[PDB]
Symmetry: D2
Subunit: 117 residues, 4 copies
């Protein structure tokens, strides 16, 4: 269905962070990152449809959020090159992962919400 979704918020303007590039990678057996999925956040700051239950197998995944380009479009010079979230997906009942990021120019936070539908 939709086992992985990303949401990005802008703490300076109190708004969804729209049109932010997100790249997802999976760790391959040789220890390198393979492209897995990508997209841009919508009007609501969300990115859906990255993958499906069948393809999203147990493994280590990296979600990269292009925060620098977002701030530069606003005319604000930011600190980070990008924000990176690295985690292991574990089967253990049916799981859905929501990765949220809250952005400021010199600070971000990220939270995972993991639920069973």
């Amino acid at each position: 269905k939709c086992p992985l979704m990303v949401k990005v918020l802008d703490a300076v303007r109190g708004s969804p962070a729209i049109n932010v590039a997100v790249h997802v990678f999976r760790k391959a057996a040789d220890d390198t990152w393979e492209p897995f999925a990508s997209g841009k956040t919508s009007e609501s700051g969300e990115l859906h449809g990255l993958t499906t239950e069948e393809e999203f197998v147990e493994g280590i995944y990296k979600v990269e959020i292009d925060t620098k380009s977002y701030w530069k479009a606003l005319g604000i010079s930011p600190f980070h090159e990008h924000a990176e979230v690295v985690f292991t997906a574990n089967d253990s009942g049916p799981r859905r992962y929501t990765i949220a990021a809250l952005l400021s120019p010199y600070s971000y936070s990220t939270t995972a919400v993991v639920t069973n539908p």
Copy 2:
């Protein structure tokens, strides 16, 4: 419609914070807080239906989240008595307010997302 909604997340368990009491107050002319609306967060950690466009007039509002009771039910002793969010509602186009809080035992964060539907 639904111009004010509250969402609460648990950073320790990576889950919605369920069954958390929330009280909303409005500042009255004599500078005291009058009860305005209340409820408990749902399974998804959200609280909807607090008020309507007609009643939600410009003013200063306080949202109180009973965080202490939440942690005590989990067996964790927390720092704060509650979390409080105080803000002015301003008419300026149609506005919807989402107040989010992310809870840990010794730390919380709160963010406002303000959008036009």
Copy 3:
């Protein structure tokens, strides 16, 4: 120092300077009584609010005037202030650091609690 406040600015990547802070203690009649006040320094810190002798058991409120801070920078922020409410010293004297990280539409606050 039994009670110290530290405030950072997440937009500029700097300490938040000249931020007004007011501290209250809940009195017997359930009212907030003024306890101490001050402004953050160039390092974003506020020291010297109280002493160990005066800082007795109780419920305290630390109010940080975030709105005035952002307005002076030309930004119209969401919150009127940030308030932190906590019980202090109920298992004996501790040292409290209250940190706040500020953005115009969001803030976080953390307590670090040490046993002398």
Copy 4:
């Protein structure tokens, strides 16, 4: 100190002690080269990673081993580590404080950047 790391624990309200930190610098061939490493002290801080002379312009990565920290406390956390990637010293020498606030399913990181 040109580069300092500070790590706090939001579950316990304390500094995060004995946290491994590794720093890398992007080399000419676009690989991450090891630059410095260490562990946080009893105050949650890591000092002495580098010097002004060695800390030249570049893209740096600070990796904080959050997973090992939580596991030693009996908690199975979400993230493998926290990584902070930034360009340093491109308008001249600055001093950098990288702070991280940790919870098992969430973290925040802030930079405070000062001009000597």
